[model samples]
Target: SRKFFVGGNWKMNGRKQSLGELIGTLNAAKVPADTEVVCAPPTAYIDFARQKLDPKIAVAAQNCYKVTNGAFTGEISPGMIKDCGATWVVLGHSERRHVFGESDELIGQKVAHALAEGLGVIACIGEKLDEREAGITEKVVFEQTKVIADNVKDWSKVVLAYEPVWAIGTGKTATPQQAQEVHEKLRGWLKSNVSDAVAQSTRIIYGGSVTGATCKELASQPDVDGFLVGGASLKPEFVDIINAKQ
Candidate 1:
């Protein structure tokens, strides 16, 4: 079986002092050795987060640009992210895709560059509420996955995150079956489309509004390898979520 992985995406929130306190909590907390924990603070604080966080807990960038350096004024590259002491990058988040109008091509480019720069990637894909209502969720997700897959040369450095747009930040409305059913299908897709070995080794984690109450139940599902947490990742309860598996 694959190793248990949990990620805390502290997206766009937190100040220096407050994040220090949260890092203190995680540093002092007892995390199970069998599980891998990564905490993603905003890009501005990635270095600070890495410095303060326990080495056992990794730091990830919320996003990264596709190239190393250029005139891209507001963009940070994967090289810059690695220089910040973060070992991973979160790419193709729904907010990046839907909110910022980034296409699969751009997301795939970013994923490719991040891996090329040697940072582990947390690549996200999901269908919107409208697509979900139309029952084309799998089609939308698979197409997005294919784009990411085409750009990936190493599966070991990648972790797939499925964050259904309909379920994000709206509250915990999606059931465990909902996560499991899609993840199972995704595993099958990896088996046939990638390779049986990739399907078995790659960890496909769930991402949405994961709370203390909803986490354990969502984790009990077989195919739900781990989580890409939001909102609550900045809080003390994130420890509980990491502790969900073992």
Candidate 2:
């Protein structure tokens, strides 16, 4: 079975003192033995998290550029993240795609480069409200998955996060059943387009307005591996979501 994985995406939030306190809270919690926890703080705090956070919980960079090094101003590279003691990176996040205009091709390049540099990647894929409302969620997700799959040679280094754009940061969440339906279809797509091993072993997580109250039911779904928490990750309730599998 795929081990349950939970990730806290702190986004553009948190400061040194507050983040230190947050780390303390996580350090004090009894995370389930079977679950894998990762936190993606802003690039500026990646090193701090690596130093102060619980060792059981890994650190991830919220975003990274496709190249290792260059005149890419205002961008961090996979190598830079690795050098800072981070082992994972979150790529193709909805904010990057929708807000910042990162194309699928660019995200694919970053995924390939990150994997090449030996960094674990949380490769995100999902649809907008219009696409879902148009009944083409599968098409959008499948294309996003294909771009990354085409670039990636190894499946073990990647975790796919499905965060529908509509549900993100809007106090809206895809119901347990809604999330499961998409996850199941994605798994099936992987089985057919990638490999059975990838389909079975890869952790396909849910995102978008996840919280402690709603996590257990979502975690119970066979295809629902875990979560990629947003706002809730900064609060005390995150500990409960982390231990939802328990």
Candidate 3:
């Protein structure tokens, strides 16, 4: 069976002194043995975090380049991340898409490279408030996944993080039914485009304003497997979010 997964994205946050203590606290926390925990710190701290974290907990890079190695001034690559000890990566985040102008095609190339290097992926996809209001949320998500499903053959190594652009960092969250609706729709897309086993085994998780108060109900949804927490992930309540399944 697929395990419940929780990931903390500490985007542009943390210092060397405090990062170590934070990692130590999370490493010692009583998270479920079956739950998968991954933490993505800033690029500069990836190696530092990995070295201090327990083997049971994985370290992920918030983003990676499509290139293997090149003169791309400040871009980090999947090859570099793998060599530096990060085994998982999060791609296609709404911030990257809307803020940094990352397109589906670009995200597809990154997923392809990450998979080529045998790295696990936390592939993100979602619609904006405008798209959702237009009633095309499923269509947007389907196109995003189609990029990977068409490129990466090993769907087993990818975990889909459904983070709606409208909800992220806006103090807004999807209702359990709202999240389940999208998750179930994505699952149906998987069932049709991929194998039944892949549809059954792939982990489809939610993100965006996920907190202790909302996690349990969301986690209880049939299609909602876990979370990819943002702001709340940096707080003490992250432990509660991680243990929501219990």
Candidate 4:
């Protein structure tokens, strides 16, 4: 069985002072030993977070550049992130795709580069609101997955996050059924295009306005392995979301 994983994407939120409280809460949480947990903090606080976080719970970088060592002014490279004891990196998030202009090809490069550097990746893929309304969700997600599938030969190092554009930070969530449909489609795509081992072994996670109440039904879907939680993940309610499947 695929292990259940819950990742909190803090996004651009938090600061040095309050992060300790969050870590302390997680440390004191009554989480299942089998449930794998991680929290992504801003790049500036990676080292500090890593030092304070429990060893069982990992720390993740919200984003990382493809280049290992670079003169790219403000960019954090995979090497730098890894050096900070961050084992995971979140890439191609909707905000990065829509707001910062991160293209699929660039994301692919980032994924490949991170894997090469021995860092695990959370590769985000999803359909925009307009694309979903136009009945092109599958096509859009498939195309996005294709870029990484074609370039990166290793499926063992990646977690595929499906966070439809419309739902992200919009107080909108794809219904459990709706999310399941896309997740199943993604599983089928991986089975046909990649390998059965990958189809069964890889973690296919859900995101976008996820909350404690809604997470149970979504997590019950056959292919809905875990979650890449956003807004609610920042609150105490995140503990509820993580333990929902229990």
Q: Each model's TM-score, in the order given?
A: 0.97, 0.97, 0.96, 0.96
For residues 14-55, write the lDDT of model 1, one tens digit per residue.
Answer: 899999899999999999988999998988898888888878
Q: State the lDDT at 103 in candidate 1.
A: 90
- lDDT tens digits, residues 176-198, model 2? 89999999999999999988989
| Model 3, span 175-232: residue lDDT tens | 7888899999988999999878898999999976788888888989999888899987
Global lDDT for candidate 2? 0.92
Candidate 3 Cα outliers beyond 4 Å, as residue runs: 169-173
Off by over 4 Å in 1: 169-172
Model 4 per-residue lDDT tens digits across residues 39-157: 99988889999999889888899998888786899999889988999999998998899999999999999998999999999999998777887889989999999997876778888
Backbone collision tally, model 3: 0
The candidate that achieves the highest lDDT relative to the unseen native structure: 2
Candidate with better lDDT, 2 vs 4: 2
For every candidate, C-alpha RMSD to the true structure in Å: 1.2, 1.2, 1.3, 1.3
Candidate 1 vs 4: which has more lDDT: 1
